[PDB]
Symmetry: C3
Subunit: 226 residues, 3 copies
DNA sequence: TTTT
DNA sequence: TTTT
DNA sequence: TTTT
């Protein structure tokens, strides 16, 4: 099985650990043994002019996934929204009401459907490939999320007198001479990881430590030696 | 405390990782320090003629648990159903409605009650030993579940041009020359593990990796060198 | 950021692993990198005269947290009750009704408000420091909980002819010549730990193993 | 409720 | 629904 | 709500 998935993750945090905006949207291609990805795309947001409320994220995700899908022709696309695995081309007012989610989630996806359902329909007509709202259950979505963490640190390294990056849930990053490695901290997930090439700038220090206000999320902090 | 528990787990998967049927029912005796089992029984189902909505699993579990219990005389039997630790001999329509569970769970256990409650009642009359629906809270149940994973791999090795075994949640297996070792991947459980003696066949290769559609579940895949 | 948090944890168990009463209330000061605490207070309960439904735990916690806060002057106090981070001084029946919690949770905090809300307002007036009900979301709270586990084992060491201590969720303890080290068993938490100096008595054996009735909780057993 |  |  |  070959799967393309996408996710947005990583946030700039202020000094009191409040998120300012998100950083990276990533689409990944995942193949057996489903532990990493060797082919991926990234789109960076502007975290300082980001609306957390919101929903530019899912639109960017489905677009980027389709873009990667046109190149690598996967069996299926996984979208990071836990709706029970329903096909996005089948999302109308009727099927959304039947979904087992909150009344808030329903009214929101009714709004999203107006743009996303035609998009998925067209792509399915072209290829037969479904875009499914699978979310939390998907390992490829989790690998995308890890890559969003990695690319968030890459963005931070490239844009830093100091920066705080809130990583996606329970993952760590490690800096090497010419690359950034990201790993899940949850061994129950079976060793999920990512690796991205980058030049590491000089004159800066970094630290990885727990977000004190959001348990199981780590902060990657960059400081200038200046 | 000496505990007999049982669980059914391990599934044959098709190539799209969809479960076909379950494989192993195991009953274990668990004693201090409650990390493994040295005395256990196994019953193999036919996964290609299995009704996944048949719920033959729990009936198989309580029978196998009672069978082992008669041999080792434990203090209590743990059944894998998270009902708050209620005694099975006390399960009637009255007590089931009072349970803090789903309405589907309630209707499932009203039917199950018809056979299981008399079974538990007789066993208690005979021995004084309760059968409790403790489920997720039980460490002996989790050890039973880990052994079901191991015996499923043993079954796979003994019955394979290729097989996909879907393991119980977040556990790994290790193949040695004359045995299979199973371990929880969750260190929060405090190091739960099992070990089963077996002959490992020639002319086959294997791999353990994440199920891409079900996060925190692993797949054990066997392939012929063919 | 400098944070004071508190928690009650650790229980005496009987031979069938049923909890009898809680042992330790701990308040900690937590600073960057937010993995441990070097400054903390402990208050021991009487586990053999404890009402597990009494909710003395939360009253003891806010008292001890405030006590430590007066000394180390933190930015904020974290209380171990998952109410969304609401300020305790802002807790009246009106704001409690709006809380996204169970009807039982609401009626418990209806009761608690009578004493704790004036206390928080009083403390805020004196220092400007908020007491927030953040609970599960807080790392300092988890560090307090780990310390409650450590102090429960110290209590076990100080009172042992034999004892079963049920530790807080998924943590381990290790006994060294002159100290007890406690660690989260969950690597997702990113390496939370604590360490307490104590004199370890002679003539004792101890063992740590899973509570067979409560998955992901460990038992500390000590014998003479 | 259980199951991957 | 998603986000730290 | 919290506790093993």
């Amino acid at each position: 099985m070959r799967i393309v998935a996408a996710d947005t993750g990583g946030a700039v945090l202020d000094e009191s650990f409040q998120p300012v905006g998100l950083i990276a949207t990533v689409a990944v291609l995942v193949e057996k043994p489903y532990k990493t990805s060797k082919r991926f795309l990234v789109k960076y947001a502007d975290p300082y002019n980001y609306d957390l409320s919101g929903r530019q994220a899912i639109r960017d995700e489905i677009e980027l996934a389709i873009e990667l899908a046109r190149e690598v022709s996967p069996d299926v696309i996984h979208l990071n929204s836990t709706l029970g695995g329903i096909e996005v081309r089948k999302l109308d007012e009727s099927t959304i009401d039947a979904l087992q989610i909150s009344d808030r989630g329903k009214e929101i996806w009714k709004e999203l459907s107006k743009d996303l359902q035609p998009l998925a329909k067209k792509f399915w007509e072209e290829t037969g490939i479904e875009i499914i709202a699978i979310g939390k259950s998907s390992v490829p979505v989790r690998i995308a999320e890890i890559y969003a963490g990695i690319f968030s640190v890459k963005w931070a390294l490239d844009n830093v007198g100091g920066l705080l990056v809130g990583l996606p849930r329970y993952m760590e990053v490690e800096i090497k001479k010419d690359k950034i490695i990201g790993k899940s901290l949850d061994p129950r997930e079976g060793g999920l990881y990512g690796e991205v090439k980058t030049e590491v700038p000089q004159g800066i220090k970094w630290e990885l430590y727990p977000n004190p206000l959001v348990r199981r999320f780590m902060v990657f902090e960059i400081t200038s030696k200046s």
